[PDB]
Amino acid sequence: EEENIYSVPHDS
Amino acid sequence: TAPPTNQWYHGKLDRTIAEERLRQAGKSGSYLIRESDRRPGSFVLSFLSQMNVVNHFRIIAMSGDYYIGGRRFSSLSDLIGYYSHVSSLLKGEKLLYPVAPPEP
């Protein structure tokens, strides 16, 4: 199954 | 300063239920922390944005510390404190409302 996408904080 | 763990930690929880729990809260700035079901032993900060979009940020636990992006925190309390009071998590948005599990 395709993994979900994760975000990175605005400061990184 | 940050709310106690019982107020925002959900244990191992998949993304679908995490988003449902945040949309039941329904307020921008709502957040929770969960263990990822897909990458067990690593954690996720799930956050309901001003645009009714849940954002998910990995938190990697290493040596009793927590890493999000390239930033190191010694506790999840310190991490939540930082993105509640010190730095924006998204442009113009900080952590506001901890969401507790319906079961502790």
Side-chain angles (χ1 to χ4, degrees), chain B residues 2-104:
Chain B
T5 304
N6 65 275
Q7 289 214 275
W8 43 252
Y9 186 64
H10 292 237
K12 184 147 58 194
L13 198 74
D14 69 293
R15 174 173 296 207
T16 294
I17 299 296
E19 298 202 1
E20 179 69 33
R21 288 184 182 178
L22 295 173
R23 294 199 159 91
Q24 291 286 317
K27 304 202 78 127
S28 296
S30 295
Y31 67 91
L32 56 85
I33 294 188
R34 53 186 173 93
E35 188 185 359
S36 175
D37 72 313
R38 300 262 263 277
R39 189 184 288 185
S42 73
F43 304 94
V44 186
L45 176 56
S46 294
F47 173 76
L48 180 60
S49 86
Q50 268 161 14
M51 297 307 308
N52 194 16
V53 172
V54 179
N55 288 64
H56 302 273
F57 309 86
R58 289 193 189 284
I59 302 170
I60 305 303
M62 262 209 49
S63 300
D65 281 5
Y66 297 92
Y67 293 84
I68 175 166
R71 185 73 169 69
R72 179 200 57 79
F73 302 92
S74 262
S75 67
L76 289 182
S77 178
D78 285 11
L79 187 156
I80 291 170
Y82 180 79
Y83 285 113
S84 300
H85 307 117
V86 178
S87 173
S88 283
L89 180 63
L90 299 175
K91 199 191 144 199
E93 314 199 31
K94 290 181 185 68
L95 298 178
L96 301 180
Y97 309 126
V99 175
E103 45 82 59

